[PDB]
Symmetry: C5
Subunit: 272 residues, 5 copies
Amino acid sequence: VEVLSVVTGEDSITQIELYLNPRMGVNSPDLPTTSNWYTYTYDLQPKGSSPDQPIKENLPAYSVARVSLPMLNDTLQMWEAISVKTEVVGISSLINVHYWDMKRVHDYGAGIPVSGVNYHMFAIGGEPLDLQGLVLDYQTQYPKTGPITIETVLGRKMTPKNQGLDPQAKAKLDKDGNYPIEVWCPDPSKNENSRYYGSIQTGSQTPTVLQFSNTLTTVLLDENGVGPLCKGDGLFISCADIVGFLFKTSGKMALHGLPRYFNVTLRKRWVK
Amino acid sequence: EVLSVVTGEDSITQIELYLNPRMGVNSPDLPTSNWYTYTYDLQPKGSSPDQPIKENLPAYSVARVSLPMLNTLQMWEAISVKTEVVGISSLINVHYWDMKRVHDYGAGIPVSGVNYHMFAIGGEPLDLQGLVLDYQTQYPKTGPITIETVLGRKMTPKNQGLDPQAKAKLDKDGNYPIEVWCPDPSKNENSRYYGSIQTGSQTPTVLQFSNTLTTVLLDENGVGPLCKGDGLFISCADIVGFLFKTSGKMALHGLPRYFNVTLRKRWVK
Amino acid sequence: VEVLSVVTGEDSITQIELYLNPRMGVNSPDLPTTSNWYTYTYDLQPKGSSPDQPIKENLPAYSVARVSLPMLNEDITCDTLQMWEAISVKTEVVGISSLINVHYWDMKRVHDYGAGIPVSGVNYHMFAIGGEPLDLQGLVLDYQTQYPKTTNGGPITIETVLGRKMTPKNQGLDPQAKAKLDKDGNYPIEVWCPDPSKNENSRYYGSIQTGSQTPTVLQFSNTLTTVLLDENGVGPLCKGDGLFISCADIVGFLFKTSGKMALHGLPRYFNVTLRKRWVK
Amino acid sequence: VEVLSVVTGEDSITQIELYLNPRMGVNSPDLTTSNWYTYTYDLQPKGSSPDQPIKENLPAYSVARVSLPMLNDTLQMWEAISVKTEVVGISSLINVHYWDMKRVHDYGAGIPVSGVNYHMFAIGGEPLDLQGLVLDYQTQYPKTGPITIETVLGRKMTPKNQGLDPQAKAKLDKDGNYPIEVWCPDPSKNENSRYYGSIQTGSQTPTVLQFSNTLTTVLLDENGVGPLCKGDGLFISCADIVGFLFKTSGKMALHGLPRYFNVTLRKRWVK
Amino acid sequence: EVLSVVTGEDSITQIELYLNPRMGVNSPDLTSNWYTYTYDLQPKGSSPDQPIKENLPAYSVARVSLPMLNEDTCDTLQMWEAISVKTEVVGISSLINVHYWDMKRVHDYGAGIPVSGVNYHMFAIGGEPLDLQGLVLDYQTQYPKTTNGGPITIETVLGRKMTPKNQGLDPQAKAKLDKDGNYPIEVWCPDPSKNENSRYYGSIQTGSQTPTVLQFSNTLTTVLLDENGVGPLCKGDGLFISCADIVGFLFKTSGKMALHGLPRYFNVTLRKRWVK
Ligand SMILES: [Cl-]
Ligand SMILES: [Cl-]
Ligand SMILES: [Cl-]
Ligand SMILES: [Cl-]
Ligand SMILES: [Cl-]
């Protein structure tokens, strides 16, 4: 790519709106009987014997969408993403401490609120996000494809090197609800045409602390003033928002997600 | 379409008000009213379905303020606000008569735990999106306005996520539960809102107050919220934590919020 | 009031130094026997039954002083006069280091054979600089609280300013429950906060921290300066040539062997810079 | 080593990408005890003296010397001006269903990785300078294996080694050989390196970490000079302890993650 | 009266040093097995408190001799002026040690409880000794006598017994940090009403098991200039450097607890300044 000048004219600027619903394990709300736990996992438990053999419902996954932009056309125009407004939706729902099956903090008290393990990330790019594979335990037996994991891309069993960084463990984030978060992270050695921002918080009952405001804007331009450039007139948007554990009366525990909203501003750019 | 700021003698004004919290016990003059600014006891039943009482549903505060009439017309434009949570100092009380002790012979457990704080300034009612923790919750009929009220029918599993139909406007004080409605980011172009949450059960309540802090309400193009029909809409929620009772029972508590908005006259097409 | 230009001259800038010792409940160190708990409350606890009847010693109050400034004018009849204007302040909490003491003889231990539980839990910190007394708004946790009557030697509370008993509305903001910080150790912190609807000629800064053993986290440095000018470049203006200084610094609980608990507070230092200003 | 002007030209700028896998104790994935790669063994106070820690319970610094292109009295040197760095695999720490994980309570999820964190990275034109200091001087470290204060002194530690001893100094020249708990960056040297670190103590303290491809560190000092690579060698160093793996039995092991680097360099004239 | 910066070849100097902590066991040259620690800290259980010197962490301090400048007791003179400092706590990484043999296990069969809890961090740079204020938790506490090997406390500088006012701000209880290991932290804080010729920076963290959280970097610099652009002026050609760095508790198997401290390094930059 050779980046030229910013197009000037009538319709040089456009805006994109959308939302992405979470993919925590029970991914659809339309299924006959299972959909009651939509936006949650099933119960998460150490097995007690080897090896771990987790079910797809216990594997929170990344959200993705390819957004179609107005069609523009070896010298050509491309859409350049310059900024974004993003926000986690439904934060106020987490004040509910009276859910029928909530474990009481102590005898005759309110429920333990959704708290503990958080994971938040969003990404905007002109092509699918690049992913690096790495797991806590290489002997974990993940389901076949279904979710895509390390042994799905290698075509063979994981070895101990997959507890660290293995250059062969790479994939592209092209499918909604299909790449487990505990297996995949953004690959820093690529993603030149993408911008990502993320964080984690561990612990069991750690406070969930979140802000929301319609006045916050993220600038997407790099150090040369270039934003992600959209190949084939497609904008790729990605995220994950785990907001903590639902604590059940029995002692069982499930992870919960929230949806994320996006407003992206783009402009036309000459490239060769 | 926005034109030029009005240059004149009396082109700037100041709006000053407060909003008392609406936690469930909403009025201070009832036969009952002893729990004004609190909920009743919050306690998961243990078997389904949940059917919450209206006194256990903290709701948004809102007020419409009438502005001096002005009439291509002139409109009031909000440009900045000073806002403050009132009575923060009251939470040092660790000797409420029926306060659960921290340990034997010790002081009471102070108001702490779940905090929720937001405020909004707009030229029209705040736009709301509905999303609940549990879709099988039996919210009181219309009393409080919830997703069932706006849809006409029962909630579906999809209301545990973002349902595009689950929309409403914050037009009534003490009538929209916080746990059902949050501000809608797909709209609200003529409003500015700011909010945060903190979960946990004994998480310290940590708050600041100062008369030196100002929020600028202008957007990127130098434009504030425009008051159509000479009405400024002010909205807030301020949950400060639980009061812990001897029995083990717990109730949520709120504090009032103070406002001082500055407006200027603006030409519009 | 019309603010004019800054006075240009020789002795146009002055400094004002002082400190205020905390008013936690035991407020004097000169008293016969009980003065061993100076800078502390007594033991705080729920009564068990209605209503609460708290004592003086269990009620931390705000500290305050009026400081007399050098007189500026040789004629008061003039429409235009010089007034002192506070522009900046250095302020610090004194004795923060003392809180490393985990060997008070009657300290509850963290566990068997261990050190004492350090001063921790509830914190409340505020200070104000103004050209008049700080404006206050009354608000309480529980309106049924029976505070000692001011006539009986007690502090000043909401009933005191209303002439009658509190009602359920005093758990919210009640326009009638207002007062002014003019006596040192007489306005209880749990009753009165600063009034944001007034206080245009004062600057206030504050915070709270709840929880029972929450860490006390505090900073100190003689390099920190708070600018006192408003958005128009005008600081508090000293009417009657008096500068009012207010504060409150609760730093946590002292945990006694039996399980009983008292709040503790620290003194505060101020150095205020003032300039001369013309007013109409 | 007097610094002159920045070299102007076509190929005056170059970029170095690499990653380093963590060295927690079990350091190779190729040995057979390698299934504990990126972890220590079980850390467990004995209850009586002395402490004789095994080499698998001593997380060490990661390091690489990168060979830069040939450049050549006055000569050209590579100067490090900026770095993009990121901790890799942070999302793996959401797993709370490891087969032998201790539960938070009955029927509950496993306790997530948390507690003790230690993060640091350094970019330099030469090896990083180290200072020795230990919790307890009586600790019997394994003999050379790991390089410790006794190794560099010849004789045994004394009580002064619980504070700063100017004789306890070393150079970070070997990957997985210098124990984090013995060696810290030496602030009295390191003029030709930049370093950044932090620690967090506690047992179940949350692990709180960020990642973004938008963050850059500027390596220039106050005079506008970055580290200068002597003999064309760039030294990259790091450590990233992310907390404890809590096991069913009561036992606990420390865990580490890998760190990725993209470093920008320019040619500089020196005398 | 502060005049102009002296312009020349050798008008700028740099001063380097470290300070080892004074936690109670202050020498490594013996009982020195507990150097950089206190002894065991325990509420006595009965009145009054009579604490041993090994249980009183104290401030570190050093005077540094600077090059002689005035080759003459004149009206106008050259003085060294401190303008910036790089400072750093040393040995932070040592606190990842969770296997010390005597470290209390978090739970049955687990790792030790790390060093954590009470933290106190301060550093100062000045042209004269740091000015101190005395204030104590309990005025009844009986600190050991100075002439019997012990530290300097309020009783020492008063020449009479502490009273209840010493639990607040008493203006008569003031002093100078002119001795290392002699002034206890729990007794003395920096006096904000003086120290016009010093710059101090401090903080505290209480609680029993609070995470110790510290940063280290050779890129961080503190600017020592006041609002008029003047650094501390070294009269008598002496530079005063002070500090304290308590990093938490060592939790012992038996339940007993001791406080721990770490060393601090300083790189100060100074220039020559004309003064009246
Ligand atoms: Cl997070
Ligand atoms: Cl909040
Ligand atoms: Cl506070
Ligand atoms: Cl850290
Ligand atoms: Cl600290």
